[PDB]
Amino acid sequence: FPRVKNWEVGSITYDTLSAQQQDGPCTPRRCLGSLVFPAPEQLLSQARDFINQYYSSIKRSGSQAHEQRLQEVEAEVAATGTYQLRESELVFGAKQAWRNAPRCVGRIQWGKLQVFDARDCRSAQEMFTYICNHIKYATNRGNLRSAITVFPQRCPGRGDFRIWNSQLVRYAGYRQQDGSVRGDPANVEITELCIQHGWTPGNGRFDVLPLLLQAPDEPPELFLLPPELVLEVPLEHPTLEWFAALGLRWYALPAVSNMLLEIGGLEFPAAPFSGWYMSTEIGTRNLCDPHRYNILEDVAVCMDLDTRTTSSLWKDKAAVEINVAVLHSYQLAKVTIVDHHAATASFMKHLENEQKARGGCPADWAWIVPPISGSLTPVFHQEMVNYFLSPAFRYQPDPW
Amino acid sequence: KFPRVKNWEVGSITYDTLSAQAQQDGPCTPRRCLGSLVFPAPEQLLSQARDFINQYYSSIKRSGSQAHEQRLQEVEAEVAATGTYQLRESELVFGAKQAWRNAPRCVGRIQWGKLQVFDARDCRSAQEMFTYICNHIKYATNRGNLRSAITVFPQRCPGRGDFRIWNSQLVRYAGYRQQDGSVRGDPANVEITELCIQHGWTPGNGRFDVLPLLLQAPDEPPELFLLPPELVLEVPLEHPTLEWFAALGLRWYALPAVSNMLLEIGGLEFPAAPFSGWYMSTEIGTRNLCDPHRYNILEDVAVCMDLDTRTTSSLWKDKAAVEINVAVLHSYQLAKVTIVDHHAATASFMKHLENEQKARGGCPADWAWIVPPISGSLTPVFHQEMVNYFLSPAFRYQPDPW
Numbered sequence: 001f002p003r004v005k006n007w008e009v010g011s012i013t014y015d016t017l018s019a020q021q022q023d024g025p026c027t028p029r030r031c032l033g034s035l036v037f038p039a040p041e042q043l044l045s046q047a048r049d050f051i052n053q054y055y056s057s058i059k060r061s062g063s064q065a066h067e068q069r070l071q072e073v074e075a076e077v078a079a080t081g082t083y084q085l086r087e088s089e090l091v092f093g094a095k096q097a098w099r100n101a102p103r104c105v106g107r108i109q110w111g112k113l114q115v116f117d118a119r120d121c122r123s124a125q126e127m128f129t130y131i132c133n134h135i136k137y138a139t140n141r142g143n144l145r146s147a148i149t150v151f152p153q154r155c156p157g158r159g160d161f162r163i164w165n166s167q168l169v170r171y172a173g174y175r176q177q178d179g180s181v182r183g184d185p186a187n188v189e190i191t192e193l194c195i196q197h198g199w200t201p202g203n204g205r206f207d208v209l210p211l212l213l214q215a216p217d218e219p220p221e222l223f224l225l226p227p228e229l230v231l232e233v234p235l236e237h238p239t240l241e242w243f244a245a246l247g248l249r250w251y252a253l254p255a256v257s258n259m260l261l262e263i264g265g266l267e268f269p270a271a272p273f274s275g276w277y278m279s280t281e282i283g284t285r286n287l288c289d290p291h292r293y294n295i296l297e298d299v300a301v302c303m304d305l306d307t308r309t310t311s312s313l314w315k316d317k318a319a320v321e322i323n324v325a326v327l328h329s330y331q332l333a334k335v336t337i338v339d340h341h342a343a344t345a346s347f348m349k350h351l352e353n354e355q356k357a358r359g360g361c362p363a364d365w366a367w368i369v370p371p372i373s374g375s376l377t378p379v380f381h382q383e384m385v386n387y388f389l390s391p392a393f394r395y396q397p398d399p400w
Numbered sequence: 401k402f403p404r405v406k407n408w409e410v411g412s413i414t415y416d417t418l419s420a421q422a423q424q425d426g427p428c429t430p431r432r433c434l435g436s437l438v439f440p441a442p443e444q445l446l447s448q449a450r451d452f453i454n455q456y457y458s459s460i461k462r463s464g465s466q467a468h469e470q471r472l473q474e475v476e477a478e479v480a481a482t483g484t485y486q487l488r489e490s491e492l493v494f495g496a497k498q499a500w501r502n503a504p505r506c507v508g509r510i511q512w513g514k515l516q517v518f519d520a521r522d523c524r525s526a527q528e529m530f531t532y533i534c535n536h537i538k539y540a541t542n543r544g545n546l547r548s549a550i551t552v553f554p555q556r557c558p559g560r561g562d563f564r565i566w567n568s569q570l571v572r573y574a575g576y577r578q579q580d581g582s583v584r585g586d587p588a589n590v591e592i593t594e595l596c597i598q599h600g601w602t603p604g605n606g607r608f609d610v611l612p613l614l615l616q617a618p619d620e621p622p623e624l625f626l627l628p629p630e631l632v633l634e635v636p637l638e639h640p641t642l643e644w645f646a647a648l649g650l651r652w653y654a655l656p657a658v659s660n661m662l663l664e665i666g667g668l669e670f671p672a673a674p675f676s677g678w679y680m681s682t683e684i685g686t687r688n689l690c691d692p693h694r695y696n697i698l699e700d701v702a703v704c705m706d707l708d709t710r711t712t713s714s715l716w717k718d719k720a721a722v723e724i725n726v727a728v729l730h731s732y733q734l735a736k737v738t739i740v741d742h743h744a745a746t747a748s749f750m751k752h753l754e755n756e757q758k759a760r761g762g763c764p765a766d767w768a769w770i771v772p773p774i775s776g777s778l779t780p781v782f783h784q785e786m787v788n789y790f791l792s793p794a795f796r797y798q799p800d801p802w
């Protein structure tokens with residue numbers, strides 16, 4: 001059992017949860033923890049484990065209902081090769097997959113998750129309808145609510161449901177003749193696929209992409225998001241009057257749509273989930289990464305900072321002011337947002353809660369510590385143990 | 401078999417083949433990663449010695465030469481007759497530079513080939529240890545134009561006590577524990593402060609009292625030596641546009657000189673081998689001054705900057721910390737004391753990574769310690785995947801001598 005120390009306070013816990021099912025990339029000879037992407041008999045083992053977790057959560061372990069559900073899943077796997085989750089099992093499973101995600105700093109919220117059951121979905125058009133209801137519910141006119149919509153599970157001899165977009169709201173990136181990008185460089189690939197499937201492109205820096213939705217065994221189909229459904233926030237700064245003139249904006253709803261949800265050995269390749277933004281995601285990563293919008297030096301130069309010498313810390317000063325502008329603009333627009341200080345303090349509470357409830361908490365230090373002001377937050381001084389529990393959200397290959 | 405290592409800013413990919421030579425095991429397993437943890441005879445010796453000698457003769461392109469063959473035979477005969485062996489001076493120099501080159505948590509390693517190595521393996525007494533340490537400090541400080549150096553005292557030997565420096569660094573500020581539980585001075589040094597008082601030091605009561613050295617010669621109790629004030633160059637902290645900042649009375653010292661690590665070369669162990677470079681400014685401004693369990697000045701600076709400290713969403717913490725770091729950089733430059741900011745230092749570490757891929761096929765690096773503690777993703781190392789492993793020669797943690 002790993003000993004885990006908090007170096008700010010000196011407190012020690014032991015992770016007993018890590019003893020519980022998959023293997024990561026590290027060995028005794030070398031740590032690869034910094035890498036971004038590290039039978040029916042096997043299905044029943046994972047199914048049995050999940051059903052056991054569920055009957056524990058509803059305080060009916062070893063009960064008659066518990067034994068009958070295990071026998072029921074065995075019988076279904078024997079007759080069909082797969083089995084079907086009850087609605088309440090799906091909800092519990094989706095919440096566990098969030099609770100178990102090591103790279104998510106927002107997991108104090110894991111028990112408050114609205115689950116939309118879309119396992120009856122038949123077509124891409126129905127898929128579009130479910131997604132529009134999700135966006136509307138989750139946005140809630142700016143009072144954002146975490147949600148997930150679960151489309152039908154994978155089954156053998158039948159293609160998956162897939163959302164080709166990486167998120168439900170994404171800005172286009174148009175490759176220029178010189179290699180550079182107008183718009184978001186992260187989305188060049190999906191922008192071109194949208195164009196190759198017949199979308200008429202724009203030419204702005206913040207063009208909302210259409211959805212490419214794949215129903216089983218069909219080519220992907222294009223759907224345009226109604227503009228009144230996509231809430232955006234113009235970026236302005238509270239004292240830098242010129243900041244608004246830069247025309248920067250971001251969208252309200254972070255809705256990831258390319259991960260696979262795994263529950264009890266069942267796989268849901270299309271299960272988009274959404275929360276609300278932590279401000280550093282927008283102000284530091286999306287706007288300041290050199291391979292994203294890369295506007296850090298544009299801002300610093302307008303702040304009249306000395307950008308010809310690194311030791312003026314112009315990069316740090318401009319980055320903080322862009323993060324201030326994100327926080328101010330979302331609060332002004334009444335769109336839910338959390339700064340990195342408040343988010344990391346809540347994650348420290350989550351760690352304390354999970355120590356009492358499960359004996360530990362899988363956490364990826366490099367992803368929990370925010371990308372600015374790392375050691376100013378309490379998670380920096382907190383040792384963490386990284387391991388994979390199920391139910392889980394997993395990366396999956398692009399559908400193309 | 402070999403890990404793929406990608407840079408996500410540029411998309412470039414390398415393979416770390418150097419990791420196969422990792423000799424020691426780390427704390428991770430396939431089932432859980434522990435990379436964020438701070439703290440993870442004859443035939444054994446001879447194979448470590450042979451590997452090091454082989455490394456040495458490869459570094460000078462004289463592999464398989466008569467000199468190479470003769471040295472391996474000489475070491476093999478020395479270990480059989482004495483149970484150990486002695487490094488040649490050139491081997492010690494190479495070994496010390498290799499240990500620095502191999503240190504996964506050091507962002508400064510672009511400098512690894514430029515290291516002054518003082519051979520103190522003839523030292524006999526604590527008084528003479530003090531002479532070598534003063535000469536080291538004078539050479540390394542160089543009136544502010546800092547030069548990297550290491551002094552290596554005699555190796556560990558069965559039946560004799562170790563040379564040890566009890567202090568964690570050659571220059572440290574005292575920490576005095578108060579009644580309320582708080583600390584006057586540096587909370588990191590409360591233990592060594594009390595140890596100095598228990599060996600007769602008359603303590604001050606300031607926030608920046610330079611501690612004496614506790615020096616231990618073999619089989620002797622530690623002996624207390626006061627550093628002459630002219631040896632210890634210090635930098636008063638001021639801020640280029642916040643004029644009240646200088647009135648705070650903050651200062652820091654020029655020379656970071658770590659004295660509590662063990663140097664291991666070819667199976668030999670040097671428990672006293674203090675080394676020094678120059679500061680990266682976030683060590684002083686973010687960690688030493690703003691850590692809540694250190695001097696913890698962040699909120700006072702924010703209040704003095706007239707920032708609204710009632711809500712976190714003003715990012716008052718971030719703004720105050722950036723200005724403290726500006727002050728450190730401005731003050732050292734004003735004092736003409738070498739310093740590097742975290743942008744220039746991480747840019748040079750990226751160059752080091754490129755050099756080491758060509759020279760050796762990889763480079764052990766600990767991502768959490770290479771990425772600076774403010775503005776992480778504004779530096780190139782943030783977007784660089786890294787492989788962490790243990791090579792030898794190496795600097796190792798070791799237990800406190802008390």
Ligand code: HEM
Pocket residue numbers: 094098101103104105106107109113146147148273274275276277278281338343367393
């Ligand atoms: C409710 C507010 C939430 C906040 C503030 C939040 C915050 C974050 C942040 C900052 C990251 C780092 C992602 C990156 O930098 O790429 C992250 C990752 C992640 N989040 Fe959360 N999140 C929230 C809700 C959710 C929800 C509702 C789910 C799923 C039900 C979820 C699942 C995940 C997963 C799986 C990752 C892993 C990222 C990856 O592997 O690329 N989060 N979260």
Ligand code: HEM
Pocket residue numbers: 496500503505506507508509511515548549550675676677678679680683740745769795
């Ligand atoms: C010359 C300029 C140098 C710079 C800018 C530099 C920078 C740094 C920094 C920022 C750290 C992390 C410190 C922390 O946050 O606790 C570090 C660690 C380290 N440095 Fe360097 N350094 C330099 C020279 C040296 C030299 C000359 C040596 C030895 C010959 C050395 C050996 C080490 C080792 C062994 C560590 C790891 C410490 C640990 O594991 O706790 N450094 N360095």
Ligand SMILES: Nc1cccc(CCc2cccc(OCc3ccc4ccc(N)nc4c3)c2)n1
Pocket residue numbers: 106166254255256258259273274275276277278281395396397398
């Ligand atoms: N506050 C907040 C809350 C929820 C979501 C977010 C957005 C940040 C985030 C969270 C979770 C997952 C995620 O993205 C997964 C991803 C991204 C790119 C990929 C590219 C290729 C591939 N095969 N998989 C990918 C998976 C982003 N923020």
Ligand SMILES: Nc1cccc(CCc2cccc(OCc3ccc4ccc(N)nc4c3)c2)n1
Pocket residue numbers: 242301302303304308
């Ligand atoms: N000595 C000096 C030394 C080196 C380089 C320079 C050029 C400074 C510079 C470079 C690039 C762009 C730039 O644009 C400044 C700018 C733009 C708009 C502003 C709006 C409002 C405001 N208050 N300031 C603004 C500054 C400057 N100079």
Ligand SMILES: Nc1cccc(CCc2cccc(OCc3ccc4ccc(N)nc4c3)c2)n1
Pocket residue numbers: 508568656657658660661675676677678679680683797798799800
């Ligand atoms: N730019 C720069 C250059 C050289 C040195 C520094 C200081 C930062 C640093 C570097 C290397 C080692 C180091 O400290 C090692 C240490 C610290 C505390 C310990 C407590 C107990 C123990 N058993 N070992 C310890 C070892 C600090 N900066």
Ligand SMILES: C[C@H](O)[C@H](O)[C@H]1CNc2nc(N)[nH]c(=O)c2N1
Pocket residue numbers: 034035036366367368408782783784785786
């Ligand atoms: C190489 C590095 O591990 C990688 O780029 C990580 C670092 N930490 C991160 N942390 C968060 N929250 N999000 C990220 O995308 C990354 N990227």
Ligand SMILES: C[C@H](O)[C@H](O)[C@H]1CNc2nc(N)[nH]c(=O)c2N1
Pocket residue numbers: 007365380381382383384436437438768769770
């Ligand atoms: C728990 C965490 O890994 C630990 O506090 C580390 C993180 N990264 C660090 N990075 C540096 N440069 N120095 C440190 O002392 C630490 N501490």
Ligand SMILES: [Gd]
Pocket residue numbers: 641642643
């Ligand atoms: Gd002023």
Ligand SMILES: [Zn+2]
Pocket residue numbers: 026030031032033428429432433434435
């Ligand atoms: Zn690891």
